[PDB]
Amino acid sequence: GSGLKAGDSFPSDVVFSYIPWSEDKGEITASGIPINYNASKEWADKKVILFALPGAFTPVSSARHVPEYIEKLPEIRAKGVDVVAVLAYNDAYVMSAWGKANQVTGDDILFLSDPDARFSKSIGWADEEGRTKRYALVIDHGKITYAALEPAKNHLEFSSAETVLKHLHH
Amino acid sequence: GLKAGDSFPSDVVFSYIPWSEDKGEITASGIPINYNASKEWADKKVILFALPGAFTPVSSARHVPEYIEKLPEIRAKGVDVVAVLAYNDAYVMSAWGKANQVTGDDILFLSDPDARFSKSIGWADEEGRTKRYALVIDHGKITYAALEPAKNHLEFSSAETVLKHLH
Ligand SMILES: [Mg+2]
């Protein structure tokens, strides 16, 4: 891959897969329709936090990583962030279900699939099993302003809500 | 593929998280371990049904709930293991089990890693998902084998149909 650092442009043609939340499909046992989400296009005029993690329903990810972003969402929005998105290698059906498991509604946090971890692979941040690694990006109108890969699979620090917040608070 | 009278293949290993009370919550994750199906099923009567994926429409609305409802009849016919199989990793299969309010081993929610078992019998699709199918395995021997004619077609692998082939 290529790695990403602050000051880099967000790559072009980045496409994720997801199921937009809807009231009719609010039950976790109800499935919606997966569609493409063109992050490069959607995020051109937005300030975005993208955090990736080993997978939906994994231990650290489920116990700390996603709950902390939910808890900090009001402060994150207070700092001008338009989109918060979690990313993993799981398909859109699973990411959708995970959003519901975490009692997220609307688009408060986007639960996005990186199909075959292809985006994460393209920047060198996927692991040997084809999972995305744990990392965070802050992308402000197409420019990377924060980028951190965790030093280990089960280490949550540089991609945490609280840490990303510190960098928005500057 | 497989057919009635075939032996269940050797060295078949799935991945799963055994349900436990302390991890009962969908947001509480256990740790995947290997499930040596060939070894475990040698002296048991087993239903294994595979499907395109956890949290997929037909699988979630009909395929799994119908097995859940028929569990008492299934057990009354001498079946020792009921397992659902999909290409999702064990974390996802585990959560799906909780989403369906299944506990213990009433139905096992099993991962076919990279659909490798399903590929080995030629019953995986071009995206690497398992197809929708069912096997009844009785002490290591296949007594029923069904592959659905399409991804969203539920008939020969349904609980009703498998129940009618439990003689
Ligand atoms: Mg017919």
Numbering used by the authors:
A (entry chain B): 1 to 170
B (entry chain A): 3 to 169
Text lifted from the article:
The intracellular Asp f3 is an abundant protein in A. fumigatus. It contains 168 amino acid residues and BLAST searches reveal considerable sequence homology to the thioredoxin superfamily, the peroxiredoxin (Prx) family, and the PRX5-like subfamily. We experimentally confirm the predicted peroxiredoxin activity of Asp f3 and demonstrate the functional contribution of its cysteine residues for catalytic activity.
Aspf3 wild type (WT) and its C31S/C61S variant crystallized as a homodimer and showed a typical thioredoxin-like fold. In the WT structure, both C31 and C61 reside in flexible loop regions (large B-factors and lack of well-defined electron density for one of the chains). The serine variant showed little overall structural change (RMSD 1.7 Å), with large deviation of the aforementioned loops (residues 24–35 and 58–64 RMSD > 4.0 Å). A corresponding movement of S31 by 4–5 Å is likely driven by formation of a hydrogen bond to backbone oxygen of F57. The dimer interface comprises an area of ~710 Å2 and ~730 Å2 for WT and C31S/C61S variant, respectively. The slight increase in the overall dimer interface area for C31S/C61S (~730 Å2) is due to the fact that the loop connecting residues 24–31 is ordered in both protomers, whereas the backbone cannot be traced in one of the protomers in the WT structure. The WT, as well as C31S/C61S variant, exhibited close similarity to oxidized and reduced forms of Ahp1, respectively. Therefore, we expect that the structure of the C31S/C61S mutant to bear close resemblance with that of the reduced dimeric Asp f3 WT. A three-fold reduction of the WT catalytic efficiency rate (kcat/Km) was determined for C31A/C61A, and a ten-fold reduction for C31S/C61S with t-bOOH or H2O2, respectively.
